[PDB]
């Protein structure tokens, strides 16, 4: 037990996972264009939520002295699972750009829509492999759908954005917010 969380420096903190789950949610990796492992929401049931110091935008750089600079997204989640009951971490403290997509024959956009467990917004969950969104390749898991064809979805429901995206017919102009 040495220090509290302060921005600007490569901090080194330790969390006690104990019997509860760590409860982090990750975005990015070497497989993605983001090229960083970034915390996206802290699940309230988890241990880091108990700990209190990790906020929802913190960049993870190593777990148990395992450098994540080359770790893919899947590699980074297992790195979270392989932690003992104690946890060793090193952390640091949106990008907005447009993506237009054309709906494929039968499926549609080929992406999943969900909301944060605690917090407003609506984000991309899963990208169907042969999907229309996959072959475009610019979207990744955790990307926020800011608007759809101009209309701002920032404080919209999951039913709202689901309904708009499903019923849209031709080319779908999306704004996307991503962490940094």
């Amino acid at each position: 037990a040495t220090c509290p969380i302060v921005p600007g420096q490569e901090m080194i903190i330790e969390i006690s996972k104990g019997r509860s789950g760590l409860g982090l949610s990750i975005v990015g990796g070497k497989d993605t264009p983001l090229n960083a492992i970034v915390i996206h929401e802290v699940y309230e049931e988890g241990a880091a939520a108990r700990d209190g110091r990790l906020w929802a935008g913190d960049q993870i750089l190593e777990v148990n002295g395992v450098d994540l600079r080359n770790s893919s997204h899947e590699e980074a989640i297992t790195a979270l699972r392989q932690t003992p009951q104690k946890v060793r971490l090193v952390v640091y403290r949106l990008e907005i750009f447009p993506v237009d997509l054309q709906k494929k024959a039968g499926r549609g956009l080929g992406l999943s829509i969900v909301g944060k467990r605690n917090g407003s917004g609506v984000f991309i969950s899963d990208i169907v492999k042969g999907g229309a969104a996959d072959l475009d390749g610019r979207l990744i898991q955790g990307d926020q759908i800011l608007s759809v064809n101009g209309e701002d979805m920032r404080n919209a429901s999951q039913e709202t954005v689901a309904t708009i995206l499903k019923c849209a017919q031709g080319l779908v102009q999306l704004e996307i917010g991503r962490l940094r």
Partner: protein
Amino acid sequence: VRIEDLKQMAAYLAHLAAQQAELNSLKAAHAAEHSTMQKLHCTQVDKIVAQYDKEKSTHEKILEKAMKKCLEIKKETEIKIQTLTTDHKSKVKEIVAQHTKEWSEMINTHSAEEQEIRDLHLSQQCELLRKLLINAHEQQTQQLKLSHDRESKEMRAHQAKISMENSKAISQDKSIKNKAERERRVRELNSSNTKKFLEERKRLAMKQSKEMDQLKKVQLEHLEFLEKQNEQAKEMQQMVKLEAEMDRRPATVV
């Protein structure tokens, strides 16, 4: 380091390979059930939208032409539109809600199937590794049983050599020059050798079990190390069931 030699055996590597093909078949089956449902989810909604658009255009044209040529038709037709969109907004609200249901029930069922196969593979790996180790332990033990039988064989034949050896040199002893002591010396020699051989025989039996007790010691804690290995693998697979329950929420493919 023993477990690693065990984990690169011909039978073990094949089971790993057969497990990975199982894993591919599941991903392929999951993906087919994914596409089958998206087509029908979209097929349904693009029907309902195409029809609603048709009804609105028909009503829109009706007032647009009459306005060029009004009165109550303006009032009546716009009631039909509010009637019609208000209903459409609630047909889809119902559908979009049940399309979340269908997806989420599937993704979680799919996610559960994948968890159980990963657990079944882990019980299949421990059971194989262990049975291989026991089989090695059995051919390790009774090879040692083999040496112990030959070890006794050499001793009996070695003891025969000394006894026969210590009887020629006693005949050639010139200093005796008397039968009555010679009768006694032979009795004295026979008894001493008999005692010595029985004591070396007793010490071999004791030595032999000691070394087999050491074999039991090595074998036990190899099996203990494999059991701890399977325990650690179960413990971390539980922590992915734990993190999965937090991550679970509704979702709508679009």
